[PDB]
Amino acid sequence: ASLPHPKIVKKHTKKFKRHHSDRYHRVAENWRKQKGIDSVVRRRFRGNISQPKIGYGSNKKTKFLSPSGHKTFLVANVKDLETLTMHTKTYAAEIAHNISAKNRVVILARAKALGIKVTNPKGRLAL
């Protein structure tokens, strides 16, 4: 368990998808601001998609925390994992995507020996 925290409020969980990225394949969903003179999305006409605004910013006391209440720290090896030895209530370790299968058991075995939560303990796991 992590430290107690206020109930995490997102204010917007829906993804901010680019306008007309559902209409043309050449338009990726990565958000882009509409900058056309007549754009209804830019002009904020009713019935159109929302745009990212600073008003959606998350509460600073619950920001960057996963639903487990820990902040995610990406770890590449045992030495990196030690940095969270005194921060087991605030940080959970994630194993990097490019860590070999035999190195992940060393990290996982060390993490249990110190109580660090690992957020992807089932990756590259032999069973």
Partner: protein
Amino acid sequence: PSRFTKTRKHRGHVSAGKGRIGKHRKHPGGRGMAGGQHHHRINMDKYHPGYFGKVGMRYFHKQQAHFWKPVLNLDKLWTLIPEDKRDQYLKSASKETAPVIDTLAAGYGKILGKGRIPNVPVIVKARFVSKLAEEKIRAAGGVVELIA
């Protein structure tokens, strides 16, 4: 460092900061100093008056070495004595042993009179001197010698 320019910041904006109406073009007002008497006259008269027309008389084959005469004001005259010997000359402001200051070697043609040298006699050598500069030198007890 191109990463610090507004060009990187204008990426994604249609006109690159140049306007949708103006439409940044090749040479809307001419090239160089085009129209400095016609359609750039206001600017030229406001910021560069005197630009157009002649004034004065010509000098065929002007050599600037003829007009070489760098000016040394009197308040800087003692800088031509080295820092170490300067103090021992101001002390004991003597008449029978006064410093010789050859200002030509220091690279000056004329000696001017911004003034207030201390009352120490000095033998000042120069090509040219103003009227006030010598009288301030002679007031301190020195003298001016003319050299070529």
